[PDB]
Design a protein around this ligand. Structure first.
Ligand SMILES: [Zn+2]
Lengths: 52, 52, 97, 50, 133, 88, 84, 122, 50
RNA sequence: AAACUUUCAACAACGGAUCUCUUGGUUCUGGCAUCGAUGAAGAACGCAGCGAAAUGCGAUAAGUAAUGUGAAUUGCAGAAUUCCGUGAAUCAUCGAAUCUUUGAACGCACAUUGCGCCCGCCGGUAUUCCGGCGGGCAUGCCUGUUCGAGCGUCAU
RNA sequence: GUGAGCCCGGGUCGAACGGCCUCUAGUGCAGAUCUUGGUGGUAGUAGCAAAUACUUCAAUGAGAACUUGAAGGACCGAAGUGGGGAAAGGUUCCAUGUGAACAGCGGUUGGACAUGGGUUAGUCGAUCCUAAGCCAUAGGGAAGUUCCGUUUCAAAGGGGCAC
RNA sequence: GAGACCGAUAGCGCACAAGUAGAGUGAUCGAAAGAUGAAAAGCACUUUGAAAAGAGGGUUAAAUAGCACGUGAAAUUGUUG
RNA sequence: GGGCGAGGCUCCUUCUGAGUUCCCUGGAACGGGACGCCACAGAGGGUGAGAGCCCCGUAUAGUUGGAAGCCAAGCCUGUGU
């Protein structure tokens, strides 16, 4: 599916001292919050070069 | 209260002097019907209600 | 010369349904033939000459026969489309051939 | 509060009736997957949001 | 090989239909063959099984045991046969699940619906044999 | 003091329950639901939130009348009873 | 419960004057008198006519509200309108 | 007892159906109190009484709606619940006669020149 | 059967008892990586905490 | 020498990888045209002998009628089925019905189970009082009916 | 076998799998302050030290510093550590029972867990009135979702009498 | 109806009471989580414990499958050598 | 201009072939060996392990019962206001 791995709202937390700059799922109160997104290396993300 | 007293009169031939009502925390209505002094509520409960 | 500077991926059309559409068209043609039996499935078409100097060496099928053609052939214009003859009123006969 | 509307009290009544553990005969059914009440509510843990 | 476009050879769809079939379909699925002498008597190979039938078990560890069908538990596709049971730890008797395809029916619980079933199956078999003959 | 001590003054309610969509999103002063747009006649939906559209799209609820329409279409919206059926 | 208002029950509901009856039935005076004679609607007398109407005199005619309600369903009203 | 079958109900008319409904409701009223006082093989009876009340109401409604349809068989305007449902678009759709109406010139032209049955020799 | 049902009800609680929940109504998910503690930089101006 | 630290091995732990599975996704293809004031989609509240949810249903409430099938349901309890039958079933089909409060939502409102009006019926001593039940009362627009207004144009 | 790797023995285990030639790819990891999950050393370590304070006997119980009764000692000190309410919460209230979990110890106790019970009005509030203000209608804008408008450039209704 | 697609960190966010639990005033955000066994045959009875449980002794083809449940890697840990 | 209309088509419905033969392993044959049979059916699934013949289905002609439509070879009649 063309929308697989992209049905999330996520932004990176910026350059800092603790974590990497992958986009992280915003919000709170669940395990998904703060987790990585949108990357082919990320769990529950879009693959590299999706098949058409 | 009028519906409750008329229903009691139609069902069990019960005449009441007054009726108090509340709504329980479960959502059902509770009605205290005080009967006339001529009729005995214990005889009504034993015979018609069967609450012994 | 690659015209891929728009949002081209939103209107890419593939043709996986080409044999299925051929099957559907053949089924529709068979149903039309069964409904129109014993008449032919198509109407009679005139022979006309293509316009411009590139294609005026070749003839082909036109839309319908002219009113003058039907009058000379002796077929009334109200009878003609009811017996499988296509009729065109816009076309005229500028020559006798 | 003690002052409450009828709609609020009715929804609180529904929440009070829903606040229970599952019956014990449920776990003995054939092919059951329900082990506990996963929507159980407590007055100190999760708000009703009224 | 299947030819009809309304027939699906999908294993996923077949397993979903089998394990989510309703009770009236499970009755047809839970069919058993008849015995030999019943087969020449009625010209019927197979019938759906029901309570009160007499069966002989021909497969499994309880082979060659005979008894009456005490229960048709369609919810896990099981028949309970009389005396084909086991004991628990406590020694209480619990019936042993047998699939109906592992038994053969030796005596039919006959009511007029079963007579109509057998008669129409026999008539259909004879008219197919006559048409193909 | 903009944090923990300021959080102790939060005992009012901007939103109450909406009679139409059932959410705690009816603004108590504007009398406008932030979720479904009540009391406007149309239900509030936008094309910039596919998730919000599909959270309330047709089929998420009960389909108390619409689910029986295809059967009536399949039988042709027929009217009457089977012939010889018991009744009046 | 809620306190009742004065003049909303009793003789005020029980009676109405001839003017109020005519305006309620939407008839002319000859048609109203004709219908009252034909249907047997008789004049009445309240115990206190001020409780029915403050502008009532000794010559004011009173009728029953239920009698005017019964007159509202008489099929001769449509006959009168058809003849007009 | 407590199970009333529809085969007996389809032969009655309205007054004894009302009497049966009243008796069933009275039995359900006393046996709800008997339910809150004791139990046993008894709850099947109140389930049967509930289903019997449903059956009696269904039979009464069906017979009286049939009588109303017989009354409104030959009238121009029917009650909305007795009118056919279909869909809203189907009810707003043009009737068959109005959709099949043609002009007089079209009628003359179709009378004198219809689509003929013909074949062409090969 | 009553003892078996009680045993099944008790074995239903092992995972949440290992998770140390106060009953089955305890389903609170806490922030183990808060954004205010794991993002941003501290400058010489105003700080976000003391 | 032991203890301790480290290395190797066996077993036991911790943990859930690997392998196998799959009533699920994803993509393609074929067929069809059918929501709603005759009250939709959605929301809320209820309904089972013993259910919180999911599922189904609406005070006829895990359901009614009708047609078909033909002996179940099942976790427990309790009843079956004249089995040679107007008939089990958490069965299928589905043309007759029921369908609470709402919602475009429609008497006026609604952060209230608030306040009305019109017409019938029934009950309580009741021409007046009290109570219950039933049927109604939104807006815009069209065709028609009826009642009207205006030296606006006339006749008389 | 130079090698990436391949093959066999032994143990474990339970339902599928491989060789060769072609075809095909979402095909080979130590890093990316990766991504998810799991686990160490630190380490039985830092602490668990505001709000003056606890002690004796008996009972219960497997087990009592933090359960109860009695006996003593203290504290809040009437702008209270008291008796009641508004907001907010929603059953936390009461009785009985209780394994584990939670009460950063312990627990026989508990706002925890389990089953039940409990909120009675013509006079107390809501309901009624209007305030600051908000929304219909007439009508005028706006492509429109709708904006203004609240007394207007509206035929916006009450009463009486009648031979 | 199908596939030279994916095989539970994959494939839709969702194979499970998933647009659920949960968070946010709100617009919105939004998971984790499938597999005992062919059949519960889910351990009678004895004994030790307050209990959880332990040990005998059965059930199973297998408990080296005990509702922490197919297979059971590594990090890390205990015992023995 | 009217009215019949044989016949045909569409949709639901009853029904369809053949081993549970013998031996071995196994907890259980659906495994191995032997002897057969059906096939316009050797697609798929279930059944205690890889089942054409155990069960549901699968192929093909049809064959029971029912409703509503459409097409249609032909045949009766009026005749020109
Ligand atoms: Zn809303």
């Amino acid at each position: 599916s063309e929308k697989a791995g992209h049905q999330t709202s996520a932004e990176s937390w910026g350059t800092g001292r603790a974590v990497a700059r992958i986009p992280r799922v915003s919000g709170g109160g669940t395990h998904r919050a703060g987790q990585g997104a949108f990357g082919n290396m990320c769990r529950s993300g879009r693959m590299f070069a999706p098949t058409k | 209260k009028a519906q409750i007293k008329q229903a009691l009169k139609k069902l069990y031939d019960i005449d009441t002097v007054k009726i108090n009502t509340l709504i329980r925390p479960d959502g059902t209505k509770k009605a205290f019907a005080r009967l006339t002094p001529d009729v005995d509520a214990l005889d009504i409960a034993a015979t018609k209600l069967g609450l012994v | 010369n690659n015209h891929f500077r728009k949002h081209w991926q939103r209107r890419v059309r593939c043709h996986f349904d080409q044999p299925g559409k051929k099957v559907t068209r053949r089924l529709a043609r068979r149903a039309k033939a069964a409904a129109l039996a014993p008449r032919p499935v198509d109407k009679l078409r005139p022979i006309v000459r293509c316009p411009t100097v590139k294609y005026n060496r070749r003839t082909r099928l036109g839309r319908g026969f002219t009113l003058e053609e039907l009058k000379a052939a002796g077929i009334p214009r109200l009878l003609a489309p009811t017996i499988g003859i296509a009729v065109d009123h816009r076309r005229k006969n500028l020559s006798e051939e | 509060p003690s002052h409450k509307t009828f709609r609020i009290k009715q929804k609180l009544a529904k929440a009070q009736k829903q606040n229970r553990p599952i019956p014990q005969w449920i776990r003995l059914r054939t092919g059951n997957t329900i082990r506990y009440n996963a929507k159980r509510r407590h007055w100190r843990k999760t708000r009703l949001g009224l | 090989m299947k030819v009809r476009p309304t027939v699906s050879s999908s294993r996923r769809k077949a397993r979903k239909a089998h394990f989510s079939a309703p009770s009236s379909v499970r009755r047809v699925i839970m069919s058993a063959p008849l015995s030999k002498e019943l087969r020449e008597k009625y010209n019927v190979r197979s019938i759906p099984i029901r309570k009160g039938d007499e069966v002989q078990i021909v497969r499994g560890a309880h082979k060659d045991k005979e008894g009456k069908v005490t229960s048709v538990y369609r919810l896990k596709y099981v028949i309970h046969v009389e005396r084909v049971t086991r004991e628990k730890a406590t020694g209480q008797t619990v019936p042993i699940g047998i699939h109906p395809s592992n038994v053969v029916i030796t005596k039919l619980h006959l009511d007029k619906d079963r007579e109509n079933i057998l008669a129409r199956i026999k008539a259909g078999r004879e008219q197919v044999a006559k048409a193909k003959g | 003091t903009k944090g923990t001590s300021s959080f102790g003054k939060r005992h009012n309610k901007t939103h109450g329950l909406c009679r139409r969509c059932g959410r705690r999103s009816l603004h108590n002063q504007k009398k406008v639901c932030a979720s479904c747009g009540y009391p406007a006649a149309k239900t509030r939906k936008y094309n910039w939130s596919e998730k919000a559209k599909r959270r309330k799209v047709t089929g998420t609820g009960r389909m108390r009348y619409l689910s029986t329409v295809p059967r009536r279409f399949k039988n042709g919206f027929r009217t009457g009873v089977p012939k010889g059926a018991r009744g009046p | 419960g809620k306190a009742k208002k004065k003049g909303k029950s009793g003789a005020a509901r029980n009676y109405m004057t001839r003017t109020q009856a005519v305006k309620k039935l939407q008839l002319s005076l000859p048609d109203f008198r004709k219908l009252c004679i034909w249907k047997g609607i008789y004049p009445r007398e309240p115990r206190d006519r001020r409780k029915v109407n403050k502008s009532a005199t000794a010559s004011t005619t009173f009728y029953y509200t239920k009698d005017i309600q019964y007159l509202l369903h008489e099929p001769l009203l449509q006959k009168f309108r058809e003849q007009k | 007892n407590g199970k009333v079958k529809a085969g007996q109900l389809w032969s009655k008319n309205k007054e004894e159906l009302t009497k049966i409904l009243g008796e069933l409701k009275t039995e359900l009223s006393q046996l709800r109190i008997q339910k809150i006082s004791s139990s046993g093989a008894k709850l099947n009876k109140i389930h049967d009484l509930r289903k019997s009340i449903a059956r009696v109401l269904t039979v009464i409604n069906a017979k009286q709606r049939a009588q109303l349809r017989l009354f409104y068989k030959n009238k121009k305007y029917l009650p909305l619940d007795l009118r056919p449902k279909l869909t809203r678009a189907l009810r707003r759709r043009l009737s068959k006669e109005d959709a099949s109406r043609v002009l007089e010139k079209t009628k003359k032209r179709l009378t004198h020149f219809p689509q003929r049955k013909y074949a062409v020799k090969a | 059967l009553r003892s078996k049902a009680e045993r099944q009800a008790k074995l239903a609680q092992r995972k949440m008892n290992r998770m140390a929940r106060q009953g089955e109504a305890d389903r609170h998910i806490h922030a183990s990586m808060p954004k205010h503690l794991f993002s941003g930089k501290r400058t010489i101006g105003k700080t976000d905490r003391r």
